[model samples]
Structures are given as structure tokens and as C-alpha cells.
Target: KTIGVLVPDITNPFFSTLMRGIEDILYKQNFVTILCNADIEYLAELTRRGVDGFIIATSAVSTDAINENLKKQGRPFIVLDQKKSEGFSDAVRTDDFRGGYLAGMHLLSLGHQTIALVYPENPPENVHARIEGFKSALDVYQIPHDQLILLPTQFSKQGGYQITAELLDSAATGVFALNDELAFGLYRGLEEAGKSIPEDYSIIGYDNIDMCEYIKPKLTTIAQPIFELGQTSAKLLLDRIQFPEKEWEEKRLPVRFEKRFSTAPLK
Candidate 1:
């Protein structure tokens, strides 16, 4: 059997490792996968190639037309990440709100007050949810919302480096990057500015990628079970193939804050 796997950007280690999990499960079941970016052009081409099913974890800003077209294909498919209930099929995504709340509470636990968040200007829905939950926690803890600094930038390492550079003179003693890439980039820019990790600045990042461990002062982050996300979606796709009339399912896995050396108590 052949399957189609769609993702937004394989360059992000988070998605790359998730894709790996999908491949591992399907391969053991004697199925071949054609992994590709979730582009409309690519989707049509994959359909033309006569794929048996699809597993998707899309990250595009819009997927209205693409979702419609996929339904028209009348093939078994499962949405792996980020749920969109309108005109879509079964989905499996992380409990993003919980992840965000945990991250926020973790920082507060370390007595961080002046916190800065560096993120993209035009963020995705999932990212927005994360921020919402994070802010909600901050409110619950009676932290002044005004103390939260918001820095908008592209979703890239360079964006992180550039924004952190701009905030070098600011009073933010703690920073919460949207992802690990930004966290790592902050380390680079801050170091060049003579700031030290967890001493001069405390940082936390999301997406516990492998490189987090290798970097000096290992990053403290929110670890989403990306691998399990993949495996679960793949299994769902197979189940749909076997029972096309089954009721669609929506899943939201939990996430956790992995404490490490990067974050320290405010002094």
C-alpha cells in the first residue's frame, strides 16, 4: 500500500521528527509513504500518483480550498496536527492550551516577572492558542499583563537573533521564545552582547528538539509528543481505510515542561 504524508516545513526539526515517526509505523506495516509539503500543487500531484491514503500535519496559513479538494478525492485521510472542524476529517493534535499554561506557570515558578515573548507577526491559529493559554496563566497568577513584552518577527533563527538583538537593552530578565530555534538564536545574539544564560537572562522554549540537549546550558522547553502524534495519525489513517463509515475522531495529546539548565530563578 502507498500513503501520502503532508507537512508544512520539514526544515523545522519538530515536523521532521514527527514525519520520522509516521514513516516508522507505516514501514513496518509494508506501506510506502510519499512525504511532501502541504502545497495545493503538491497535493494534486500526489492524488494523481494514485496514493491509497494520506496523513497530514499542515502548517499553512490557509487550507480552505485544500481541505475541500481532499474531501473530493474520496480517499482515506487523517489530520495529524491542528484541528479544523469545518469541512475536515479526523484529527490528532496536542493540547496546546495546557502546554502554554505549563510553560507560563513554569516561568512564574522561577520568580520571573519581566518576561518577553518573541514571535512572528502573522502567527498560526495553534500558536495563537498557545499565547492565549500562556497569558491566561499569567492573569491567574496576578502578574501584570503590561510586563509581558511582545516582539514580532519572522518564524526563523535569524528573526530570533535579530529581535533579541533589538531587546538587548530592555529590562526583560526572562524570555519565552515560541520555539527552540528562537531560543537557540537568542543564546547566540545575547552571548555576543555579553549576556549570560540563566544568570543575566533566563530563557524557555517550546518544541523539545534533539539539538536542545547538545547546546550549552541545555534548553528548558515544552516537549510535545511529536512521535506519538505521527504514530497515532498513521494508525488512524489505516483504521479509516478499513472502516470508511466510522465516526471521525479528534484527539488532543498532552504536553509537558522539561526543566533543564537554561532557566534559573530570578535573583
Candidate 2:
């Protein structure tokens, strides 16, 4: 069987790592796969190319129209990384809210009362869910809204560096970047500003990519089962193809918090 996989941006380490997972599984199953970026602006192109199924890992917040367009083509599809929207298709992704909560709780446990949240301006639903979960953890600790500094920026290294620099004057003692990529940028920004990790500011990031361990101070992050997400998503798409009338299933994989040198008790 042939499958079409859609990803938001191939440049991001998270998606690239997950793609490795998906491709590995499909290869073992002897399935031909076509990978594409979700922003191609042409769903029809996949249909014209003759794909039997689709697996979308888009970072876009609103994907109803894309799925609606896909459904008309009558091909089985599965969504990965993004959250599940009712009446869409099957979904398999990491528990974003839980990931966010883990990051926030880690900071709180380290005695960080004033924290900065760095995320994308127009983030996808999964990122929003992470924000909410992080907010929930703050609420549990009675951390007021005033103590929670929100910095919506790009999900890139440069974006992380720029936004972190902008908040250098803020009273935040800790920062929770939404992804490892941004956290790497944050490191650069903080370094450029003459600040040190865990000493001047504690940091926690999500998507524990391989690079997290090699960075200075070793980034603390929430680890998602990225490869499992790809394997499960591909498996779900194959199942859907066989049982076209089956009700869509939503699967949320677990995440773990990795304690590293980037966080410590507030000095």
C-alpha cells in the first residue's frame, strides 16, 4: 500500500525525528510513502499522485478545511502531532497538555515563582493545550497571572533568541520554552545578554530532541515518544484503510520530564 504523509516543516528537529519513525515503520511493512509539507496549498496534488492513505502532522491550528478537502477524496487519513478535532479523522500524538504541565511543575518545584512562557504567536492547538496545562500548574501553586509572563514569538532558534532578549529586563526567574529548538535559541539569547542558565534563569523545554543533551548545561525538557507516535499513526492509517466505516480513534501518548542542568533552585 502507498501512503502520503504531511508535516508542517521539515526543518524542525521534532518533525524530522518523527518522520524517521514513520518511514521506518512503513519500510518494514513494505509500504511506499510520499512525504510532503502541510503548507503546500494543494491537497489535490496528492490525489492526482494516487495515494491510498494520508498521515498529516501539520502544525497549523485550524485544519478542518484541509481534512474536509481530504475527505472528499475518500481516502483514509490520520493526524499526528496535532490534537484531535471532533468529526475529523483518527489522531495519534503526544499529550501536549501534560507535557506543558510537566514543564511548569518542574520549574515550580525548583522554587521559580515568576516564570516566562515562550511560544509561537499563532501556535497550533497542541501548543495552546501545552500553554493551558502549564497555566493549570501555575494556578495549582497559586501563581497569579501577573507572575506568569507570556511571550508569543516564532518557534525558531532566532525567534527564541530575540524574544528571550526582549524579556531580559522582566522579573521572571525561570522560562519554559515550548520546544527544544526555541530553548536552544533561548540559550544563545541569554548568553548574549550575559545571563547564565539556572544561576540567573532556569529553563524547561518540550520535545527532548537529541541535541538537548549536547547543549551547554544540558537542556531540561519534556520527552515525547516521537517515534512511537509515527509508528502508531502509520498503523492507524493502515487499519482505517481496511475498515473504512470504523469510527475514528484518538490516541494520546505519554510524555516524561527530563531533569538536567538547566534548572535549579532559585538563588
Candidate 3:
């Protein structure tokens, strides 16, 4: 049996790890794997290659275009990270909105009002959903809507380093960083600027990557169910391989926040 998967910028350590989980499952099942970067040209060629199954997990393939092509191909495929509900698409994903809400409410409960959200610039739906939930929580707590500023930037250390400090300089005392990579960069930037964490600022980060815990003032972060997400998605793919006519269903793993030292009650 053969299976295909596509990821955008596997250069991101998180997605790279997702690839590892996928390969582990596929290899154990005696399946050949065709892994491709998040490039549409590459994906289109793979479609031409007639692989047995596919997993598309990048924003590079716009939801509309990919769905259209997949529908035409009549290929057995699942979305690894992104989800679009049209047609017979199966998915494994996290509830970014709910997780973001929890992170937001936690900060608010800790007496934070002037919070900044460093979200991805021209954000994908997941990033947008997160900000939506975070804002909803802030609104529910009457935390002064205007006081919750949203800063958008690319997903890189430079982006985090530059944008987060600008946000704090403008009077943001609390921060909700959507990814720990950005959060860690923001931490370095903030520290370099002569501010101390949980003293001058409190922060919450999302996607509790392996490195999140090792950094100074251990980062408080939302944890993705990465292992479960990979394993279950592979299981779902296996089932589809055996029974193509089975009704397609969506699966979601739970997400959680790991409270840590980086965040504290407003002082």
C-alpha cells in the first residue's frame, strides 16, 4: 500500500514532528510514503502520480482549490491540520478557538486587562479562530475591548521579536502568543528591552512545543494533542483504505493549557 502526505514548510519544527509521527504509523503498516513540502506544484504532480491516499496540512493549498481538485480526482484523502466541511473530507484537528478562549479567560482571571495578542499576519483560519475566541473572552470579562490589541506578524523569531515589543511598548501588560516559537522570540526581545516577565509583563503561549518548557521562566502555553492527532489520523486513513465506502467522519483531539512560570497575576 502507498500513502501520500503534504506539509507546508516542514521547516517549522512542529510540522516536521508531525511528519515523523505519520511516517512511524505508515511504516509499521507496510505502506510506501510520498512526502512533499507545502508546495502546490508538488502536490499537483503527486496527484498526477496517482497515489492511494493523501494528507494535505498546509494553507498553501487554498481550501477551495484543493477541495475542487480532490473532488475531481475522487482520491481518498484527509486533511492533517486544516478542515473544510464540504464533501467527503475526513480531518484531524484541534479546537484552536476553544483553546484560545481558555488562554484568554485565564489571563483575565489573573487580573489582566491590557493584553496584546500577537497573531499571525494575514492569518490562516486557525489563527483567526484563536483571536476570535480570545477576543470573545476579553469581551465577556468587560476587559475594555480596545485594551485588547491584536498585533499581526509572520511566524518567525524576527516577527515576534519586533512586533511583540512594539505591542508592549504601547502599554500591553499581558500577552497571548499563539505559538511558543513566537513567544520565545518575544521573550528574548522583551528581556533585551530591559523588562522582566511576570513582573513587567505576563504571557501565555499556544502550541506547547518541546522547547517551550526549557526556556527561562518556563512558558505558560496551550498544548496541542500532537501524538494523538497523528496516530488517530493515521488510524482513520487505515480504516478508509480497508473500507472506502464507509461514511467519512471528522475527528478532533482535545487541547489544553499548561500553566507555567512565564505568566502570573497582574502585580
Candidate 3 colliding pairs: none
lDDT of 2 by residue, 1-267 (tens): 778787887888888878888788888878997777664454577666677777877754245545555777777778766534536578887888899988988899888999999998889888899999999899989999787888888879988988976679889999999999999999998898898997998999998999999999999999998778888888788778778878778887999999989999987
Better of 1 and 3 by lDDT: 1
Model 2's TM-score against the true structure: 0.93
What clash count does candidate 2 reach? 0
Arrange candidates by lDDT, descending: 2, 1, 3
Clashing pairs in 1: none
lDDT of each: 0.81, 0.83, 0.78
lDDT of 3 by residue, 66-170 (tens): 655566786677885643444676788888889989999999999888888887777777777888888889889977778777788878667789895577667
TM-score of every prediction relative to native? 0.93, 0.93, 0.92
Model 1 per-residue lDDT at 122: 79
Using lDDT, give the best candidate's number.
Answer: 2
Worst 10 residues of 3 by lDDT: 80-89
In candidate 3, position 87 carries an lDDT of 61
The TM-score obtained by model 1 is 0.93
Clashing residue pairs, backbone N/CA/C < 3 A, model 2: none
